[PDB]
PDB file of C-alpha atoms in Angstrom:
ATOM      1  CA  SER W  18      28.870 -19.487  27.198  1.00 21.30           C
ATOM      2  CA  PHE W  19      27.704 -15.862  27.092  1.00 21.20           C
ATOM      3  CA  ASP W  20      26.850 -14.173  30.392  1.00 21.12           C
ATOM      4  CA  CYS W  21      24.291 -11.371  30.291  1.00 21.07           C
ATOM      5  CA  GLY W  22      25.115  -7.671  30.069  1.00 19.81           C
ATOM      6  CA  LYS W  23      28.644  -8.109  28.726  1.00 20.13           C
ATOM      7  CA  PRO W  24      28.899  -6.957  25.111  1.00 17.91           C
ATOM      8  CA  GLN W  25      31.816  -8.280  23.042  1.00 19.27           C
ATOM      9  CA  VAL W  26      32.113  -5.002  21.148  1.00 22.26           C
ATOM     10  CA  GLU W  27      32.734  -2.248  23.709  1.00 21.77           C
ATOM     11  CA  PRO W  28      30.097   0.543  23.622  1.00 22.72           C
ATOM     12  CA  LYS W  29      31.009   3.964  22.254  1.00 24.01           C
ATOM     13  CA  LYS W  30      29.649   5.413  25.527  1.00 26.48           C
ATOM     14  CA  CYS W  31      28.328   8.662  24.035  1.00 25.31           C
ATOM     15  CA  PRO W  32      29.352  11.686  26.166  1.00 22.43           C
ATOM     16  CA  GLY W  33      26.489  12.835  28.373  1.00 21.51           C
ATOM     17  CA  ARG W  34      26.952  16.335  26.969  1.00 21.09           C
ATOM     18  CA  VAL W  35      25.934  14.933  23.575  1.00 21.56           C
ATOM     19  CA  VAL W  36      22.214  15.151  24.326  1.00 21.66           C
ATOM     20  CA  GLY W  37      21.434  14.339  20.706  1.00 19.54           C
ATOM     21  CA  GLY W  38      23.012  10.915  21.083  1.00 22.05           C
ATOM     22  CA  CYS W  39      25.594   8.978  19.059  1.00 25.88           C
ATOM     23  CA  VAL W  40      25.477   6.181  16.506  1.00 27.16           C
ATOM     24  CA  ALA W  41      26.342   3.090  18.539  1.00 23.29           C
ATOM     25  CA  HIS W  42      29.326   0.857  17.810  1.00 21.66           C
ATOM     26  CA  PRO W  43      27.845  -1.978  15.791  1.00 20.42           C
ATOM     27  CA  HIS W  44      26.771  -4.837  18.075  1.00 20.28           C
ATOM     28  CA  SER W  45      27.883  -3.132  21.307  1.00 20.64           C
ATOM     29  CA  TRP W  46      24.295  -3.447  22.684  1.00 21.36           C
ATOM     30  CA  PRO W  47      23.860  -7.242  22.010  1.00 19.58           C
ATOM     31  CA  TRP W  48      20.463  -7.433  23.673  1.00 20.52           C
ATOM     32  CA  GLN W  49      18.918  -4.724  21.496  1.00 21.12           C
ATOM     33  CA  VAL W  50      15.726  -6.053  19.943  1.00 20.88           C
ATOM     34  CA  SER W  51      13.678  -4.692  17.062  1.00 17.18           C
ATOM     35  CA  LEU W  52       9.996  -5.525  17.123  1.00 16.47           C
ATOM     36  CA  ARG W  53       8.686  -6.004  13.593  1.00 12.63           C
ATOM     37  CA  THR W  54       5.338  -6.084  11.837  1.00 10.54           C
ATOM     38  CA  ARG W  55       4.146  -9.184  10.029  1.00  9.54           C
ATOM     39  CA  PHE W  56       5.582  -7.756   6.807  1.00  7.79           C
ATOM     40  CA  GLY W  57       8.974  -6.882   8.255  1.00 10.36           C
ATOM     41  CA  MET W  58       8.885  -3.279   9.372  1.00  9.44           C
ATOM     42  CA  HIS W  59      10.622  -2.329  12.613  1.00 10.39           C
ATOM     43  CA  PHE W  60       8.192  -0.436  14.858  1.00  5.84           C
ATOM     44  CA  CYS W  61       9.335  -0.870  18.460  1.00  8.54           C
ATOM     45  CA  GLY W  62      12.318  -1.878  20.533  1.00 10.53           C
ATOM     46  CA  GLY W  63      12.816  -4.465  23.230  1.00 10.34           C
ATOM     47  CA  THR W  64      15.438  -6.338  25.206  1.00  9.25           C
ATOM     48  CA  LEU W  65      16.604  -9.952  25.153  1.00  6.25           C
ATOM     49  CA  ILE W  66      16.572 -11.186  28.742  1.00  4.35           C
ATOM     50  CA  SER W  67      16.923 -14.894  27.951  1.00  2.06           C
ATOM     51  CA  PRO W  68      17.241 -16.836  24.660  1.00  2.00           C
ATOM     52  CA  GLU W  69      13.473 -17.452  24.614  1.00  2.00           C
ATOM     53  CA  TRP W  70      12.280 -14.201  26.176  1.00  2.00           C
ATOM     54  CA  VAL W  71      12.132 -10.562  25.129  1.00  2.00           C
ATOM     55  CA  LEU W  72      11.030  -7.712  27.396  1.00  2.98           C
ATOM     56  CA  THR W  73       9.235  -4.817  25.684  1.00  6.45           C
ATOM     57  CA  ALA W  74       6.474  -2.233  26.292  1.00  7.83           C
ATOM     58  CA  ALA W  75       2.814  -3.209  26.463  1.00  8.07           C
ATOM     59  CA  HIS W  76       2.069  -0.217  24.210  1.00  8.42           C
ATOM     60  CA  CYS W  77       3.855  -1.985  21.351  1.00 12.67           C
ATOM     61  CA  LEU W  78       1.344  -4.823  21.284  1.00 12.50           C
ATOM     62  CA  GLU W  79      -1.727  -2.603  21.253  1.00 13.47           C
ATOM     63  CA  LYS W  80      -2.545  -3.348  17.600  1.00 13.31           C
ATOM     64  CA  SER W  81      -2.825  -7.132  17.848  1.00 11.69           C
ATOM     65  CA  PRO W  82      -3.198  -9.924  20.448  1.00 12.44           C
ATOM     66  CA  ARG W  83      -1.817 -12.518  18.033  1.00 10.42           C
ATOM     67  CA  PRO W  84       1.827 -13.454  18.720  1.00  9.87           C
ATOM     68  CA  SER W  85       2.020 -14.295  15.031  1.00 10.86           C
ATOM     69  CA  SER W  86       1.662 -10.562  14.307  1.00 11.36           C
ATOM     70  CA  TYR W  87       5.144 -10.015  15.735  1.00 11.68           C
ATOM     71  CA  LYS W  88       8.644 -11.208  14.867  1.00 12.88           C
ATOM     72  CA  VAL W  89      11.864 -10.107  16.549  1.00 10.01           C
ATOM     73  CA  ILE W  90      15.140  -9.143  14.864  1.00 10.98           C
ATOM     74  CA  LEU W  91      18.283  -9.802  16.851  1.00 12.46           C
ATOM     75  CA  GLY W  92      21.867  -8.698  16.169  1.00 12.73           C
ATOM     76  CA  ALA W  93      20.969  -5.727  13.964  1.00 11.66           C
ATOM     77  CA  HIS W  94      22.541  -2.301  13.495  1.00 13.65           C
ATOM     78  CA  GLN W  95      20.596  -1.307  10.406  1.00  9.76           C
ATOM     79  CA  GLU W  96      16.905  -0.551  10.715  1.00 10.96           C
ATOM     80  CA  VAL W  97      15.833  -1.422   7.141  1.00  8.86           C
ATOM     81  CA  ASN W  98      18.635  -3.214   5.296  1.00  9.47           C
ATOM     82  CA  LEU W  99      19.612  -5.817   7.845  1.00 12.87           C
ATOM     83  CA  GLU W 100      22.877  -7.690   7.827  1.00 11.49           C
ATOM     84  CA  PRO W 101      22.686 -11.331   6.646  1.00  9.94           C
ATOM     85  CA  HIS W 102      23.832 -12.582  10.049  1.00  9.57           C
ATOM     86  CA  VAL W 103      20.668 -11.098  11.622  1.00 11.78           C
ATOM     87  CA  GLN W 104      18.291 -13.532  13.365  1.00  8.16           C
ATOM     88  CA  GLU W 105      14.565 -13.300  12.693  1.00  9.90           C
ATOM     89  CA  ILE W 106      12.377 -15.201  15.167  1.00 12.61           C
ATOM     90  CA  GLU W 107       8.570 -15.246  15.278  1.00 12.65           C
ATOM     91  CA  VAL W 108       6.836 -14.570  18.610  1.00 13.11           C
ATOM     92  CA  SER W 109       4.950 -17.517  20.128  1.00 13.24           C
ATOM     93  CA  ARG W 110       3.187 -16.000  23.160  1.00 13.05           C
ATOM     94  CA  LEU W 111       2.426 -12.507  24.531  1.00 15.02           C
ATOM     95  CA  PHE W 112       2.162 -11.469  28.210  1.00 15.85           C
ATOM     96  CA  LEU W 113       0.987  -7.994  29.226  1.00 16.58           C
ATOM     97  CA  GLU W 114       1.664  -6.626  32.705  1.00 13.42           C
ATOM     98  CA  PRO W 115      -1.429  -7.341  34.899  1.00 12.79           C
ATOM     99  CA  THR W 116      -1.756  -3.829  36.333  1.00 16.21           C
ATOM    100  CA  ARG W 117      -1.744  -1.874  33.054  1.00 13.85           C
ATOM    101  CA  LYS W 118       1.899  -0.759  33.308  1.00 13.22           C
ATOM    102  CA  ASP W 119       3.777  -0.255  29.997  1.00 10.01           C
ATOM    103  CA  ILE W 120       5.745  -3.503  30.121  1.00 12.40           C
ATOM    104  CA  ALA W 121       5.146  -6.874  28.452  1.00 11.82           C
ATOM    105  CA  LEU W 122       6.855 -10.192  27.725  1.00  9.60           C
ATOM    106  CA  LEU W 123       7.142 -11.989  24.407  1.00  4.07           C
ATOM    107  CA  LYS W 124       8.072 -15.644  24.199  1.00  7.79           C
ATOM    108  CA  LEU W 125      10.177 -16.525  21.190  1.00  9.31           C
ATOM    109  CA  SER W 126       8.780 -19.482  19.279  1.00 10.23           C
ATOM    110  CA  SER W 127      12.410 -20.540  18.986  1.00 12.28           C
ATOM    111  CA  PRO W 128      15.464 -19.835  21.219  1.00  9.41           C
ATOM    112  CA  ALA W 129      17.822 -17.063  20.222  1.00  8.07           C
ATOM    113  CA  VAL W 130      21.249 -18.279  19.132  1.00  7.55           C
ATOM    114  CA  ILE W 131      23.604 -16.556  21.578  1.00  8.87           C
ATOM    115  CA  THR W 132      26.512 -15.163  19.590  1.00  7.06           C
ATOM    116  CA  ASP W 133      29.004 -12.303  19.820  1.00  7.97           C
ATOM    117  CA  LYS W 134      26.329  -9.934  18.442  1.00  7.09           C
ATOM    118  CA  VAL W 135      23.362 -11.453  20.323  1.00  3.65           C
ATOM    119  CA  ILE W 136      23.537 -11.591  24.124  1.00  2.57           C
ATOM    120  CA  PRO W 137      20.846 -11.113  26.807  1.00  2.00           C
ATOM    121  CA  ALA W 138      20.916  -8.174  29.189  1.00  2.00           C
ATOM    122  CA  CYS W 139      21.011  -8.831  32.951  1.00  2.00           C
ATOM    123  CA  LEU W 140      18.013  -8.194  35.196  1.00  2.00           C
ATOM    124  CA  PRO W 141      17.976  -6.273  38.520  1.00  2.05           C
ATOM    125  CA  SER W 142      17.116  -7.931  41.811  1.00  4.55           C
ATOM    126  CA  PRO W 143      13.476  -7.302  42.804  1.00  4.84           C
ATOM    127  CA  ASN W 144      12.703  -3.728  43.868  1.00  5.26           C
ATOM    128  CA  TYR W 145      16.300  -2.594  43.479  1.00  2.93           C
ATOM    129  CA  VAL W 146      16.357   1.201  43.180  1.00  3.43           C
ATOM    130  CA  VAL W 147      19.181   2.280  40.860  1.00  2.13           C
ATOM    131  CA  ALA W 148      21.246   4.919  42.659  1.00  2.00           C
ATOM    132  CA  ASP W 149      20.885   8.647  42.081  1.00  3.20           C
ATOM    133  CA  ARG W 150      23.048   9.888  39.201  1.00  4.57           C
ATOM    134  CA  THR W 151      24.042   6.414  38.006  1.00  5.18           C
ATOM    135  CA  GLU W 152      25.116   6.593  34.378  1.00  2.00           C
ATOM    136  CA  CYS W 153      22.770   4.772  32.009  1.00  2.00           C
ATOM    137  CA  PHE W 154      22.131   4.449  28.283  1.00  2.00           C
ATOM    138  CA  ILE W 155      18.941   4.398  26.250  1.00  2.62           C
ATOM    139  CA  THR W 156      19.368   2.667  22.882  1.00  4.66           C
ATOM    140  CA  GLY W 157      17.298   2.254  19.747  1.00  5.46           C
ATOM    141  CA  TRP W 158      16.623   3.500  16.254  1.00  6.23           C
ATOM    142  CA  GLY W 159      13.447   5.541  16.623  1.00  7.16           C
ATOM    143  CA  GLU W 160      12.927   8.957  15.065  1.00  5.78           C
ATOM    144  CA  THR W 161      16.328  10.441  14.197  1.00  5.22           C
ATOM    145  CA  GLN W 162      15.729  14.184  14.603  1.00  4.97           C
ATOM    146  CA  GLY W 163      18.868  14.640  12.512  1.00  4.57           C
ATOM    147  CA  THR W 164      19.688  12.514   9.461  1.00  8.72           C
ATOM    148  CA  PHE W 165      23.286  11.707  10.317  1.00  8.55           C
ATOM    149  CA  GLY W 166      23.263   8.106  11.470  1.00  9.83           C
ATOM    150  CA  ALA W 167      19.611   7.760  10.485  1.00  6.03           C
ATOM    151  CA  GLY W 168      18.541   4.146  10.125  1.00  6.22           C
ATOM    152  CA  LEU W 169      21.310   2.888  12.427  1.00  5.16           C
ATOM    153  CA  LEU W 170      21.287   2.014  16.117  1.00  7.72           C
ATOM    154  CA  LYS W 171      21.876   5.027  18.350  1.00  6.47           C
ATOM    155  CA  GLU W 172      22.627   5.547  22.045  1.00  4.87           C
ATOM    156  CA  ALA W 173      22.393   8.363  24.618  1.00  3.36           C
ATOM    157  CA  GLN W 174      23.961   8.680  28.063  1.00  4.08           C
ATOM    158  CA  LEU W 175      21.364   9.607  30.690  1.00  4.06           C
ATOM    159  CA  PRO W 176      22.110   9.898  34.425  1.00  4.06           C
ATOM    160  CA  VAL W 177      19.353   8.762  36.729  1.00  4.72           C
ATOM    161  CA  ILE W 178      17.498  11.386  38.730  1.00  4.99           C
ATOM    162  CA  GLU W 179      16.089   9.993  41.984  1.00  4.36           C
ATOM    163  CA  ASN W 180      12.278   9.985  42.127  1.00  2.17           C
ATOM    164  CA  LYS W 181      12.259  12.426  45.047  1.00  2.00           C
ATOM    165  CA  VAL W 182      13.917  15.170  42.980  1.00  2.11           C
ATOM    166  CA  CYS W 183      12.263  14.249  39.703  1.00  2.44           C
ATOM    167  CA  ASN W 184       8.907  14.790  41.357  1.00  2.00           C
ATOM    168  CA  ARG W 185       9.680  18.385  42.375  1.00  2.00           C
ATOM    169  CA  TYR W 186       7.130  20.977  41.239  1.00  2.00           C
ATOM    170  CA  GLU W 187       9.215  22.488  38.428  1.00  2.00           C
ATOM    171  CA  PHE W 188       9.687  19.018  36.915  1.00  2.00           C
ATOM    172  CA  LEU W 189       7.416  15.966  37.115  1.00  2.00           C
ATOM    173  CA  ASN W 190       5.361  17.482  39.921  1.00  2.00           C
ATOM    174  CA  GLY W 191       4.792  14.238  41.857  1.00  2.00           C
ATOM    175  CA  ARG W 192       3.566  12.151  38.879  1.00  2.00           C
ATOM    176  CA  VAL W 193       6.459   9.617  38.964  1.00  2.55           C
ATOM    177  CA  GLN W 194       5.526   6.559  41.058  1.00  2.00           C
ATOM    178  CA  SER W 195       7.556   3.646  42.478  1.00  2.84           C
ATOM    179  CA  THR W 196       7.021   1.720  39.258  1.00  3.74           C
ATOM    180  CA  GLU W 197       8.944   4.403  37.348  1.00  4.36           C
ATOM    181  CA  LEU W 198      12.333   6.097  37.256  1.00  5.53           C
ATOM    182  CA  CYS W 199      13.827   9.235  35.731  1.00  5.34           C
ATOM    183  CA  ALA W 200      16.982   9.397  33.672  1.00  7.96           C
ATOM    184  CA  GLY W 201      18.199  12.491  31.883  1.00  7.12           C
ATOM    185  CA  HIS W 202      18.722  16.181  32.508  1.00 10.91           C
ATOM    186  CA  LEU W 203      16.854  18.694  34.592  1.00 10.13           C
ATOM    187  CA  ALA W 204      18.292  21.492  32.449  1.00 11.74           C
ATOM    188  CA  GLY W 205      19.796  21.664  28.968  1.00 13.25           C
ATOM    189  CA  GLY W 206      18.250  18.434  27.781  1.00 14.11           C
ATOM    190  CA  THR W 207      17.234  17.456  24.276  1.00 15.34           C
ATOM    191  CA  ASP W 208      13.639  17.903  23.141  1.00 14.16           C
ATOM    192  CA  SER W 209      12.533  14.510  21.925  1.00 15.00           C
ATOM    193  CA  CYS W 210      11.219  11.083  22.791  1.00 12.31           C
ATOM    194  CA  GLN W 211      14.343   8.929  22.699  1.00 15.02           C
ATOM    195  CA  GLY W 212      14.852   5.322  21.617  1.00 14.43           C
ATOM    196  CA  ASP W 213      12.015   3.055  20.530  1.00 15.51           C
ATOM    197  CA  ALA W 214       8.870   2.512  22.569  1.00 15.24           C
ATOM    198  CA  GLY W 215       9.726  -0.623  24.538  1.00 17.95           C
ATOM    199  CA  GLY W 216      13.416   0.034  24.054  1.00 17.14           C
ATOM    200  CA  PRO W 217      15.962  -0.611  26.843  1.00 20.23           C
ATOM    201  CA  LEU W 218      17.672   1.682  29.333  1.00 16.48           C
ATOM    202  CA  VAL W 219      20.710  -0.083  30.764  1.00 15.70           C
ATOM    203  CA  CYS W 220      23.081   0.990  33.492  1.00 15.23           C
ATOM    204  CA  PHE W 221      26.537  -0.428  34.020  1.00 15.56           C
ATOM    205  CA  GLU W 222      27.230  -1.863  37.439  1.00 17.49           C
ATOM    206  CA  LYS W 223      30.375  -3.771  38.398  1.00 14.45           C
ATOM    207  CA  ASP W 224      31.321  -5.653  35.254  1.00 17.29           C
ATOM    208  CA  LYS W 225      28.006  -5.799  33.380  1.00 19.21           C
ATOM    209  CA  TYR W 226      25.063  -3.791  32.082  1.00 16.85           C
ATOM    210  CA  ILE W 227      21.746  -4.157  33.958  1.00 14.91           C
ATOM    211  CA  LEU W 228      18.386  -3.417  32.314  1.00 15.53           C
ATOM    212  CA  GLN W 229      16.800  -0.985  34.752  1.00 14.22           C
ATOM    213  CA  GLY W 230      14.206   0.704  32.559  1.00 14.19           C
ATOM    214  CA  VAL W 231      11.836   0.145  29.634  1.00 15.24           C
ATOM    215  CA  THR W 232      11.021   3.038  27.294  1.00 19.30           C
ATOM    216  CA  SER W 233       7.541   4.509  27.554  1.00 16.39           C
ATOM    217  CA  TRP W 234       6.879   7.817  25.819  1.00 11.74           C
ATOM    218  CA  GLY W 235       3.531   8.118  27.576  1.00 16.79           C
ATOM    219  CA  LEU W 236       5.406   8.463  30.870  1.00 18.29           C
ATOM    220  CA  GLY W 237       7.088  11.565  29.470  1.00 18.86           C
ATOM    221  CA  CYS W 238       9.714  12.427  26.860  1.00 19.69           C
ATOM    222  CA  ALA W 239      12.891  14.413  27.394  1.00 23.39           C
ATOM    223  CA  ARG W 240      12.337  18.169  27.243  1.00 23.42           C
ATOM    224  CA  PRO W 241      14.825  21.027  27.466  1.00 27.68           C
ATOM    225  CA  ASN W 242      14.141  21.134  31.221  1.00 28.14           C
ATOM    226  CA  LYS W 243      12.291  17.862  31.882  1.00 31.02           C
ATOM    227  CA  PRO W 244      13.820  14.366  32.043  1.00 32.75           C
ATOM    228  CA  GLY W 245      12.185  11.384  30.375  1.00 32.70           C
ATOM    229  CA  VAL W 246      10.462   8.853  32.625  1.00 32.42           C
ATOM    230  CA  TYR W 247      10.977   5.081  32.288  1.00 31.34           C
ATOM    231  CA  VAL W 248       9.182   1.975  33.555  1.00 36.52           C
ATOM    232  CA  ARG W 249      11.273   0.730  36.501  1.00 34.38           C
ATOM    233  CA  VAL W 250      12.190  -2.887  35.617  1.00 37.10           C
ATOM    234  CA  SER W 251      12.995  -3.856  39.238  1.00 34.23           C
ATOM    235  CA  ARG W 252       9.336  -3.661  40.283  1.00 34.69           C
ATOM    236  CA  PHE W 253       8.344  -6.261  37.688  1.00 36.85           C
ATOM    237  CA  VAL W 254      11.209  -8.690  38.129  1.00 37.45           C
ATOM    238  CA  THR W 255       9.229 -11.048  40.359  1.00 38.41           C
ATOM    239  CA  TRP W 256       6.424 -10.892  37.803  1.00 37.53           C
ATOM    240  CA  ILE W 257       8.763 -11.570  34.860  1.00 38.04           C
ATOM    241  CA  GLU W 258      10.297 -14.515  36.686  1.00 38.11           C
ATOM    242  CA  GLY W 259       6.893 -16.049  37.250  1.00 39.20           C
ATOM    243  CA  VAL W 260       5.772 -15.883  33.639  1.00 38.01           C
ATOM    244  CA  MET W 261       9.099 -17.288  32.404  1.00 39.68           C
ATOM    245  CA  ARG W 262       8.767 -20.003  35.050  1.00 41.64           C
ATOM    246  CA  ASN W 263       5.213 -20.963  34.031  1.00 39.62           C
ATOM    247  CA  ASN W 264       5.585 -20.709  30.261  1.00 40.42           C
TER     248      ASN W 264
END
């Protein structure tokens, strides 16, 4: 009986001013997935959106078409030395977005056991445009530019920047389309690609966290004066629903 987007461990909620991010409270981002190689090395992030489905970036599956080449780790906080309670589930089927966007679906060969440390994130209604300045969080392990909290799950607070403004000449110069969204700072931002490719970007709504973006470094990484661009989940909801409904 675990409804999506409601962690059992309340998130640290790293201050926006902390552009370098914070180590997350363990298990406060219950849907955080870690995509792993055949041998067991984390290499990408993803989000649990149902017990049998994980939403990640197409870029993460570029090395192999075989589902058997991927296994997902759920309930983790450590990147290498996982806790014994961590769930490891092999991937049964892969589904890349039909129009070459950096988003893909992985079907778990076995349903995820929903626990207090493993809960699915909620999905936005089709074509919903998250409001300007909404507070969101990107989470993942990725490349820790520091070394403090290295190997552990981290988070960063990023406010959304409406496409109209993000596309201004001094910033993204009109390169951000409807299938994308910007979250971050226009000035005084960190210089680094945050999270894990395929990692989630969730924004709190009424009483739950909604997955509104997927991490894609190709779209653009945070820069001192440039916000990072994310794949807008809402434009692929109808597509995600179909695959889940036919597989």
